């Protein structure tokens, strides 16, 4: 019901590990296959989708 | 001992629950991890709700700015929350401090003020502990639009510490709003808690009583031509002496104050050899003078030196002859003004010891608002 910064999210692939900065609305990332999302944490209740577009 | 990415561009302003600002923050100025956490405090009763970057558990977070932001006196806000239970410190910047500290309580929100100086690649640098949520960061650089620095009495000083910054031309006041407890049973009188500098300015108190606990506020004024615009105070008492203070700052630009104007007197009695007599000396005061008219009565053939000497202290301390009442008349003429000036002195030669010609001097002149350099 709000804007703006939300929380994090954590990927890994292989032997790296990324954390990003999440906002409202959309976040893109661009992956490799295989990579994990190994965590998000959201700082209020929210909807969460995740999707690929390939 | 850290590693940080710092590819992005610095903003001078950051809100860190927006993410973009605080994508630009951690890929620029911030060393360290963080947490995204729900952070709320009380406003008039209503509760704020972000979400803002944690300094979590582990060594100290710091922000470092080595980039090539615009020349200038700056002044940072950057402000805080503590999440912890217990309070937390933080030293500011201030660009020479490393004692002095600000003191967060526990629960609650704070901002931390610093002051810095963006030239000759000087580098912001800033440690923040664990458990502080940063909210936002805020670099503007004072002097602008008729700004001043005003940082509250949230300074915390045990004997030592500096801070420092530039002053273009002008004439300022430093204002330093003070508190101390001095837990020590001496009961000090001449009390030097430090100095202001280019020139330097001592700021004393009376008396601390032992035992005791006061407030006051030092309030000081530095001319600025503009030949020498760093400015440094130091905190000078003790550092073992167990008299803590806590202080503000206020630096500010002023139009000229005369702070008084003066009708003076002195009389100097002489028997046969030089005397040279010291009249009005302001030299480290946070003021200067400006000469007015000046008169000598009792001048006879018997007196073979009278005159009026002024300096700039500050730049030399020799002095030079203002007026020579001998060569010139026992009055000054109407075009006589003297400026830029801290110290007078009457030189004087004549009588005998056997018969002593005594002399009277009068002086008109202003005091006013300013070291000079």
Partial sequence: ?54 | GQSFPANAKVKYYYKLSEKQDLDAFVNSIFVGSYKLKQISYLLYGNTKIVSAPVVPLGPNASIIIDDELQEGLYLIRIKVYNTNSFSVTVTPFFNNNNTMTYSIGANSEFEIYDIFTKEQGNIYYIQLPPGLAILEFSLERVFEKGNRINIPKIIHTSGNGYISFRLRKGTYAIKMPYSYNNTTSTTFTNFQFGTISTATIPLVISSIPANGSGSGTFLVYLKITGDYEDVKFSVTYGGGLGVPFTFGLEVEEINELVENTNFVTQSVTLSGSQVTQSILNVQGSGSHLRLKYASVSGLTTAVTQCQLQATNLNRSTTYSTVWDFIAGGSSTPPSWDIREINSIQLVANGGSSTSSVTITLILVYEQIAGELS
């Fill in chain 1, 1 to 54: 019901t709000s804007t703006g910064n939300i929380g994090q999210i954590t990927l890994t692939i292989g032997s790296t590990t990324m954390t990003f900065n999440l906002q409202t609305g959309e976040n893109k990332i661009p992956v490799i296959a295989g990579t994990q999302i190994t965590n998000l944490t959201l700082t209020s209740s929210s909807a969460i989708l995740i999707y690929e577009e390939v």
